[PDB]
Amino acid sequence: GILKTLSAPIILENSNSTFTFLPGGDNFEWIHESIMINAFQGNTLDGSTNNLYLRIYKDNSLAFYPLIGMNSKSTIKSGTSTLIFEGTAEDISYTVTFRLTPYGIWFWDISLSGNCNKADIIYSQDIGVGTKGSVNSNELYLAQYLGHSIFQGDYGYVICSRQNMAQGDLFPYLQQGSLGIRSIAYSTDGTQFFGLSYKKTNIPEALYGDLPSKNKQYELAHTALQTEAFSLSGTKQFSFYGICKTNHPEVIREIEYIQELEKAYAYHESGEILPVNVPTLQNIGAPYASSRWDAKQVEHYFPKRLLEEKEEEALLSFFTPEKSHVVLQDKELTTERPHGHILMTNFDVTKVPQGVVSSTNYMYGAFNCQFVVGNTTYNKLLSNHRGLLNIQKDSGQRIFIKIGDCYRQLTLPAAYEMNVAGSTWYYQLDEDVLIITSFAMYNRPEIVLKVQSLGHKKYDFIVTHQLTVGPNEYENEIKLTREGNILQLSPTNHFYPELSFRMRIPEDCTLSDDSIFFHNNTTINPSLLSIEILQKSSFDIVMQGFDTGNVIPFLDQYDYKEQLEAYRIYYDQLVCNFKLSAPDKIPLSAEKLNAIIHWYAHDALIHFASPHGLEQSGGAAWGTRDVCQGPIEFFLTTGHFDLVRHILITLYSHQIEGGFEWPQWFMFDHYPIHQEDCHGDVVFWPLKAISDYIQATGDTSILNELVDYRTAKDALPTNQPETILIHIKRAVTTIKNRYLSGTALISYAGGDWDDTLQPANSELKENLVSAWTQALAEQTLELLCSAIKGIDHDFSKELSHMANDIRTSFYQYLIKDGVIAGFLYRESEEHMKYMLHPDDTESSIHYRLLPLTRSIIAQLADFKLATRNLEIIDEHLACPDGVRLMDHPASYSGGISKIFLRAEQAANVGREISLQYVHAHIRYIEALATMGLSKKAWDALMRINPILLTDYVPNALTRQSNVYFSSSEGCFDDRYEYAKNFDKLRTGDINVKGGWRLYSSGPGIYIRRIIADLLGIRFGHNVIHIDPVVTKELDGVTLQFTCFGKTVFFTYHVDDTMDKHICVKSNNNILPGDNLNNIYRDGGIQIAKDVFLSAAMSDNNFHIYVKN
C-alpha cells in the first residue's frame, strides 16, 4: 500500500508569492520569494496557529469566535489570489476576504453586518520570516533573531520585524497593522497570546483580556493586534495587512512602504471567486486535559517521595526511591518550557553505537515524537515536536479517547512520571484513571505504548501517527503493508536502503488516514496513520526500527518493569555504581547528586549516542568540540576507556584532507555529511582529548592506528590513511600557521568556544586574538607533549617549544594591570588594542570569564594571576544564578553586527546572549576545584543543579528538575532593557529562567566535576588519583564507586589539623603513593593500581583524610 503526500489544495498565487492553505482555510505555507512568513504549517485536525477573533462583550459575558480556519465554521470561496470566508457569529454576519496582492502584501478585509453593543477584533499571526529550511529546522531559534520594532501609524500599533540572522544572504522583513480601524494594543510572542494556561484549557489566554502592549522577544514570534471596541448597527469594514520584504539590510527606524501599501490596498483580482468544499470534523470534541490531583490523591498514587518541590505549599514535583521524577499538573502550567523526555535504547558500551533507537515525549500528551533508528534526522518514523505550547498538537503519536459522544484528544495529565527507561502519564477521568506508558525495550530496537484503564473500564480510542519515513512530514510517499496485526513501513534510501519500521497493533483495530475525523470520510492528510480501537480497557502499540533491515519477531509479552530493571542496572554500571551515603542525615547537596547523576548520565549518553534534544530536535551529528567534551569526559571519568578509544579513531577519520583541520560537526554513521567550515578553537579539541585518553590509559598504541581522512566538499573517505600521530602533526602545522607575525599569538580565525562571537569581518578574523583560545592552545600542546614524549622524542620537543612560545605570548601580550583581556586586536606590533579588558573605555564590556577559567584549569595562570582572576569573577561576573560570560551584554543596535555576529544579532535574551551559559559555569567549577576552593566549588555546583533550584537561588524560576538546562537568562523582554538593567542580575533583583534542555556537553562535564574534581576520584595509567575538594559537610559521607572493576567505599574525613594534605587508609594501613603536582595548593595522591586493589581485597572501605 502506498501512502501519498499531503498537498495543500488551496493555492493562492501572485507575483513572487505562493500562499497555500488547507481546505478549512488554515495556513499551510506562505512563501514570498523564498521566505516563509508563517512559523508553523497548519495540520488537518487542529488547523493553524493564526486566526482572526471576533469578540462580543455583554453585561455578564465575553464571547470570542474564530473567523477563519477549520475551527471557524466559515464557508469558503476562492480565486487565484483571493479567499472569501463567510459565516455568522451570534447576531453578526461576517465576511473575511483574504487578498494576496502582487506586492508581497496581503490583506484580511473584514466586513461585519449586524447589531451589537460592544465588539472587537483580535488579529493573531505566528511569524517565521526565514527560509523554509530555517523555519522547519528550528522555529524557536529563528524567533530569537527576529527583532520587532513597534510604532504608532495612522491606525494605532504597527509591528515591523527584521530577521537578523542571514537567510541566503538576505535580512528579511515583515510589517503588520490595521487599516480603517485603530489597533489599541499588541503583543509579539506566543507566550503573551496563548499563555501557559493554554496547555490545559486549549484556549488562548489573551482572548479574555486586553493584549499587554509589550514586545516580548522570545521563541514564539507571534504578532497580535487588538482593535478598538465598537458598536454595530449596520455594516462596518476594516482591514489587517502584512508586508514581506526579502531584503532589509538596514535596521528598522520607522514605518516604511506607505505608498506601496496604498497601491496594494486598491488591488483586486479579475477572476471568478467560487465556492470550495470545506471539511468538517465529525464527533471530535475539544481536547481532554485531566482534572488536577489533590494532596490525598497524590499521597495515594505516590506514597514514597523525596526532594519535594512546593510553591505556596502546593506540590509541584518530587523524586521517588525507584529513581523516577514525577511532575504534577500545576508545575507544567508554571514552566515556560514544556516538560519532556527522551528515551533511548541501551548499546554496547565498549564501541561507538549504530542504529540506536530513540523517541521523544512531552507531558502535554505528545506520547512519541521523532521515533528514530540511528540518524536522528533521516532515519525517522514519526514527526518532530515543535513549539512550546502544543497549539499544533498533531505531531508524532497522539491519543483520542471517546468521552460521551465525542472523540477528545488527550493533552495535560494530572501527573507525568519519568524514568530513564520510560514515561508514564496519569489522566484523571470520571471514576477511573487512565495510565499511559511509553517505554524503551532493553536489548531491542523498540518503543512500546501501553494504555491501561486502572479500573479496567472500556473506552474507544483513536491513536494517530504523523508519519515521516524520512526526515520530514509531507515530503515522501510511504510504503505501508499489513500482515495480520503487524504493519511494515518503508520509503518508496541511498545510505540506508533497507530502512524500515514495524508496528504491532491491537487485534481488531481499524486502520485509516485522517478520513475518519471528517464528516465526508474525505482523506486530506494521507500520512496521518490512524488506529481506531473500540471497547478496550487496555492495549498496546509496539514500534520497531530497523536501519539495516535486521527485522526481528515481536515478543509475545511487553513488560515495562523488566525493562525498567534492566536499564537501572545499565545506568548504575555506566556511573560505576555511584552512591553517596551517611550514617546521620545525608546533606541535601549529596541527596541532589544521587538523584541527578543517572539523569545527567542519560542526558550525556543521548548527547553522545543519539544527538538531539528537546528544543534542539535537529542534531544527528557529532559536534567536533562537543564529542571531545561531554562524552569523552564522561567516559574517561567512569573508566569506559575502550569506548573513548573507538570514539577517538572515529573522530580522527573525520579530519579533513588538505586543510587538515576538523569540520565543525560530522555525521558518524553512513551519511557523508559535515560542516567543513569550522571555528578556530575546534582543532584543539581532538588533540586535547587524545592526550587525556593517553594519560588516563597509557594506550600510546592509538597513535599508530592507520586512519583515513574525509574530503571537504563531499565528506567522503579519501582512501589515503595515515597514522594518528601524522594526523596530529598535520593538525599542529595548522596551529603553527596561525601565529601572528613576530609572535606565537594564535589567530582567532572562525571564532572560539562561544559560537555567538564569530568575527563580523575579515580584519577581525585575521587580527583578533582570543585569550581563551590562546590558553587552550597552551594547555593542549603541553598535554600533547607529555602524551607523545615516549613515542616521538623530537616532536614532543617541538610541542614543548610551541606550548612555551604560546605561554610567553600569552603573558607578554594578553594581560595588562593583572587583568587578562578577553581579546587583543593586533593589525601589527604598532597597532594593537585590548577588547573585553578595562582599557577598552570606549566599549561597555570590560571583563570576560572564559580566559580566567581556562588559564586556571590549565595551571597556566601563576598563583597571583589565578587569585586575581577569582577576584574579577567575584566583583564583575558572579551572580546568584552562576558566573557570567562577560560583565555587560554584547552590543545591540537593531540587529546589524559590528564586532561579533550572532551576539549582536539576537533579539532574544537567551542561550549565550544570557551570559550564563551553564557549560562555562561548569568550567568555573573545574577551575575552583583545581584551586581547591571547596566552599565556592560546591556552592557553584548547587547553583546550576535543577533539583530544588528555587530553594537555593531565590530569583530562579522553576524549570524541569530532572534534565539539564543549558543557560540561565534574566527575564528581560528585549536587548535594550537587558543592557540598561543588567546589574539586576548581579543582585538577584530580576528573575532568571532556564534555557534549552538536555542536549549539551554540560551533563557529562558536570558528572566529571562531581566525580573526578570534587569527590576526587580519577583514573590513570595503572594508578588511581585521589584528590578531593570537599566541604566539611562531606565529612562522614561515603562514596560508593566501582574502581577497576572493584566496588569500593570512600569515606571522607575533613581534618583542618592534619600535618599533611591528604592521607588514604584501608583497615588502618596508610596507602603509599606520590603527591600530585598542583601550583595553587597541596596536591592529591597517586596510588598504584595493584596496591590499591590489594588493600581493597581485605577491606574495601577506604578512608580519605583531607585538609582544606
Ligand SMILES: O=P(O)(O)O[C@H]1O[C@H](CO)[C@@H](O)[C@H](O)[C@H]1O
Ligand atoms: O548548548 P551546548 O551544547 O551546551 O553548547 C553549545 O554552545 C557552546 C557555546 O557557543 C558551544 O561551545 C557548543 O559547541 C554548542 O553545542
